Amino acid sequence: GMTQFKLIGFDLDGTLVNSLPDLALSINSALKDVNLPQASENLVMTWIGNGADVLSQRAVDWACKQAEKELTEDEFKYFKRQFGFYYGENLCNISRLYPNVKETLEALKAQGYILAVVTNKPTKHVQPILTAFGIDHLFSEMLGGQSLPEIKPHPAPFYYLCGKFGLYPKQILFVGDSQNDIFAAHSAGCAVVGLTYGYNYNIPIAQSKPDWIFDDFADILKITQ
Ligand SMILES: [Cl-]
């Protein structure tokens, strides 16, 4: 309307949904199944951001070092199957939307913005978690960690949106909570909101220099009309 933006994109974990509690519960149950020590929720948080394989590798590497044990490859595969199972079961157990997320997405949709999710979370979990929280109907595109060959912080997912919706990068506003989001946006040429409530390796979101830094998801409305 009075902005340049046609499409607004969002990360999922740490931006729309506070999923850390269910991720931590799931990963710790799987660690227990391979007789490895369990991690604090802050530690688990620091492994999140780069997809479920990297998350799994960080978990097992930490726990093995803690315990002075190693896993065989078959044990590691087993760990990953159990972690996948538990999480699938706990997608919307302790997890909740961040404050004002649904109301804000509805407002933006009402204004005519195309809305998209771009996350490194496995693609298989994206439509289910959005459906569980009653917001799947608002999104015109939902990209996860297996959806394209390169993922955030590579700008490719942003270029895919430009192509699919017929846009210049400058017509996309992105909303994220980690440097993966902010670096991808800077590289593609998209304006980017950094949220301060999400998962960024214990690093302040200001360090990656987003275009805006917000404590409340509803503040996005102040910059979209
Ligand atoms: Cl991730």
Automatic annotation (TrEMBL):
Cross-referenced Pfam families, in alphabetical order? HAD_2
Matching entries from InterPro entries are given as: HAD-like_hydrolase_sf (IPR050155), HAD-like_sf (IPR036412), HAD-SF_hydro_IA (IPR006439), HAD_2 (IPR041492), HAD_sf (IPR023214), PGP-like_dom2 (IPR023198), PGPase_prok (IPR037512)
Catalyses: 2-phosphoglycolate + H2O = glycolate + phosphate
| Matches recorded under CDD domains | HAD_PGPase
Residue positions binding Mg(2+): 11, 13, 177
**UniProt GO BP:** carbohydrate metabolic process; DNA repair; glycolate biosynthetic process
Q: What is its EC number?
A: 3.1.3.18
Q: In which pathway does it act?
A: Organic acid metabolism; glycolate biosynthesis; glycolate from 2-phosphoglycolate: step 1/1
Active site as annotated: 11
Gene Ontology cellular component list: cytosol
Cofactors demanded by this protein: Mg(2+)
Q: Which keywords does this chain's UniProt record carry? A: Carbohydrate metabolism, Hydrolase, Magnesium, Metal-binding
Q: Which GO terms describe its molecular function?
A: metal ion binding; phosphoglycolate phosphatase activity
- Family classification: Belongs to the HAD-like hydrolase superfamily. CbbY/CbbZ/Gph/YieH family.
Role noted for this protein: Specifically catalyzes the dephosphorylation of 2-phosphoglycolate. Is involved in the dissimilation of the intracellular 2-phosphoglycolate formed during the DNA repair of 3'-phosphoglycolate ends, a major class of DNA lesions induced by oxidative stress.
The molecule here is called Phosphoglycolate phosphatase
